[PDB]
Design a protein around this ligand. Structure first.
Ligand SMILES: [Mg+2]
Ligand SMILES: [Zn+2]
Ligand SMILES: [Zn+2]
Ligand SMILES: [Zn+2]
Lengths: 49, 263, 57, 45, 67, 113, 84
RNA sequence: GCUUGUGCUGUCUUCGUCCA
């Protein structure tokens, strides 16, 4: 049914091995004259949710 | 009763003939040499700096596949069987590679001869990467241009090809019996004539071709087996053959011990 | 397309990330192994389990 | 406190969360974080 | 990208023969004759060296990101 | 993600025995042996050694699934002999054969070197 | 009114497959909710298997009310319906 | 004396996967 058998030793030696890259994006939005998002490490005391 | 005859002999390949043995015994010996003879290979890679164009796991995979000298690996212990804390000298070998390109032009090649053995078992011949000659450079690992450096620390451990193919001592084992097809174990596909459409075996001159007036012998069994064992350099061919025999004997003795202990 | 596209099977827990079928049931599902995907539904009650095991098996 | 690297002249510097994101010497607008100091290990398989 | 260390099919070490192969091709030998000289008999091993594309030479032409 | 550890093919768990023997009551003098963390390499060797014994009337093995490293053997012997004794004799005989094979190989290698 | 006297019951005297499935499910649920069992269980633990054992011995204490299209109904005991 | 935090958008568009 269109299946195939592959050699596990060939896989171990590097057959069809591949690299995968994924990128994420983020930026600081401007909401008002002084309301700006900030890149920082949040803390359970000062930060909510 | 079993007999061995050697046709060609070399450090990295032996071509022999097995006679008066069962087909199952020869096949089990082939399988044991392919998958169950222990060797030494790099298993853990600590990367202290890598500014090359190759990914870290790429270089780690390439390092795993480098054949190391495994002559005394029988005296070493398995890492999971060693009571030591972390890695010690009785279950691991430590190698270190440090490469850099000096100058603002050209390219530097990183070879497996640049791997330096730092620690290992005392007086055991294990750990050094295999080299064909004294002037051989070895396996190409990476390439570096200006301001690119590679600094790694590798740990070589003992294992078998069942866990990963990097621990296999052999590359390919040719195996063949009955070149003239007297046992009729294969039925030859043909268009006009099977005899002249199929190339002759390389051992066809080692056996007498069947007579035209001969009738099929139903009492015969495969008796003579031709096999060539090619090694990667981590072990010599005779060492591989002897250790395969020893591994099979140990497996059988373990079965016998379990049987006797079952009572 | 028809009621043999939904049938009740018995679970066998196995490694790797695919569903595994006997090859004789690929005809009622009209399925092959060149990239197809199939869905699985778990009953949540004794009555519903009995219905699956006695009617849709 | 945190090291960076310029995207053009590969110069290393530091930022204090108050300077503009720029290279000091060539004024490129693109900078990259430096690699961590934690131990990095691979299984060579 | 860079020459594989082992043959995919059988695992023979082919990663130490790339520079010798390029040298032999420089001297004017045919590709089949060069592969014969390097003792690559099985066509599984001959495929590894005959069909390899060296992409690392293109990757090395970009300036290093750290100095 | 769902791939099992490769060392599970040959490393025996603490709670899993290497060998489990149960009788097969359908026919007389038959046992079923379950081998753990083994494959065709030992199975075929033992089967074709046992098949040549005059007092062994039935011997077979099967690997139920290739994703699990185990096989099950069925062994039936004559009235006088017990199947476990036949299995022990087969193991000892193969060990002796491998011993003389190794001796002759070492002799021939020393001769030719 | 809507009930039909036991002497003039005209529906089939066999347990259909839908009735068998529903009765097994309901009995298994009741057994799993600590209802008394009417058969001797040797080593069985699964409620569905116990329900099947009860069905085979005609010991299920349930009644099937079969509805006719006009609204009337017939009451059949699980012990008087033939089960294959 | 010091104690571990408890969740997620909408609407279109395009490109794809397995059948048909
Ligand atoms: Mg399909
Ligand atoms: Zn140790
Ligand atoms: Zn700059
Ligand atoms: Zn090859």
């Amino acid at each position: 049914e269109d299946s195939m058998i592959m050699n596990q030793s060939s896989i171990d030696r590097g057959l069809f091995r591949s690299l995968f890259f994924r990128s994420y994006m983020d930026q600081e939005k401007r909401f008002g004259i002084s309301i700006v998002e900030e890149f920082e490490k949040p803390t359970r005391a000062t930060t909510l949710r | 009763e079993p007999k061995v005859n050697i046709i060609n002999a070399q450090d990295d390949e032996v071509e022999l003939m097995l006679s008066d043995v069962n087909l199952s015994l020869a096949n089990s010996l082939r399988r044991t040499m392919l998958a169950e003879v222990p060797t030494l290979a790099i298993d853990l890679v600590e990367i202290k700096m890598n500014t090359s164009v190759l990914a870290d796991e790429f270089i780690s995979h390439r390092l795993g596949l480098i054949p190391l000298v495994s002559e005394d690996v029988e005296e070493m212990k398995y890492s999971r069987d060693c009571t030591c804390e972390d890695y010690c000298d009785e279950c691991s070998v430590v190698l270190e590679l440090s490469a850099r390109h000096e100058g603002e032009e050209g390219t530097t090649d990183v070879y497996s001869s640049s791997l330096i053995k730092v620690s290992g078992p005392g007086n055991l011949n294990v750990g050094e990467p295999v080299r064909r000659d004294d002037y051989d450079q070895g396996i190409l690992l990476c390439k570096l241009r200006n301001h690119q450096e590679l600094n790694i620390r590798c740990i070589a451990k003992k294992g078998i090809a069942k866990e990963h193919a990097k621990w296999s001592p052999c590359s390919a084992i040719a195996f063949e019996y009955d070149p003239h097809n007297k046992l009729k174990h294969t039925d030859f596909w043909f268009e006009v004539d099977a005899k002249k459409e199929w190339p002759d075996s390389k051992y066809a001159t080692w056996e007498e071709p069947p007579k035209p007036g001969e009738v099929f012998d139903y009492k015969a069994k495969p008796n003579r087996f031709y096999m060539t064992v090619e090694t990667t350099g981590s072990l010599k061919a005779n060492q591989v053959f002897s250790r395969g025999i020893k591994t099979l004997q140990e497996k059988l003795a373990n079965v016998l011990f379990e049987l006797e202990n079952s009572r | 397309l028809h009621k043999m596209s939904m049938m009740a099977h018995r679970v066998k827990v196995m490694p790797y990330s695919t569903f595994r079928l006997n090859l004789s049931v690929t005809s009622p599902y009209n399925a092959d192994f060149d990239g197809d995907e199939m869905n699985l539904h778990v009953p949540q009650s004794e009555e519903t389990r009995a219905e699956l095991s006695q009617l849709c098996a | 406190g945190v090291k960076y690297t310029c995207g053009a002249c590969a110069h290393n510097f530091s930022l204090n969360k108050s300077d503009p994101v720029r290279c000091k010497e060539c004024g490129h607008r693109v900078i990259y974080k430096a690699r961590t100091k934690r131990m990095i290990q691979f299984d060579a398989r | 990208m860079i020459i594989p260390v082992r043959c995919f099919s059988c695992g023979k070490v082919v990663g130490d023969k790339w520079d010798a192969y390029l040298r032999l091709l420089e001297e004017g030998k045919q590709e089949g004759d060069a592969l014969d000289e390097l003792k690559l008999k099985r066509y599984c091993c001959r495929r590894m060296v005959l069909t390899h594309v060296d992409l690392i030479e293109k990757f090395l032409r970009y300036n290093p990101l750290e100095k | 993600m769902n791939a099992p550890d490769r060392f599970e093919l040959f490393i025996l768990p603490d709670d899993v025995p290497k060998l489990k023997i149960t009788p097969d009551s359908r026919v007389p003098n038959c046992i079923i042996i379950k081998f753990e963390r083994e494959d065709h390499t030992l199975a075929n060797l033992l089967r074709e050694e046992l098949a040549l014994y005059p007092d062994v009337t039935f011997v077979a093995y099967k690997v139920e699934h290739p994703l699990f490293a185990n096989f099950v053997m069925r062994l039936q012997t004559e009235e006088g002999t017990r199947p476990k004794q036949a299995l022990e004799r087969a193991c000892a005989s193969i060990i002796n054969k491998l011993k003389t094979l190794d001796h002759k190989f070492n002799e021939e290698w020393n001769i030719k070197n | 009114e809507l009930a039909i006297l036991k002497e003039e019951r005209t529906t089939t005297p066999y347990l259909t497959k839908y009735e068998r499935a529903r009765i097994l499910g309901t009995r298994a649920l009741q057994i799993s909710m600590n209802a008394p069992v009417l058969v001797d269980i040797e080593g069985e633990t699964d409620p569905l298997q116990i329900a099947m054992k009860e069905l085979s011995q005609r010991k299920i204490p349930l009644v099937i009310r079969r509805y006719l299209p006009d609204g009337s109904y017939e009451d059949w005991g699980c012990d008087e319906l033939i089960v294959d």
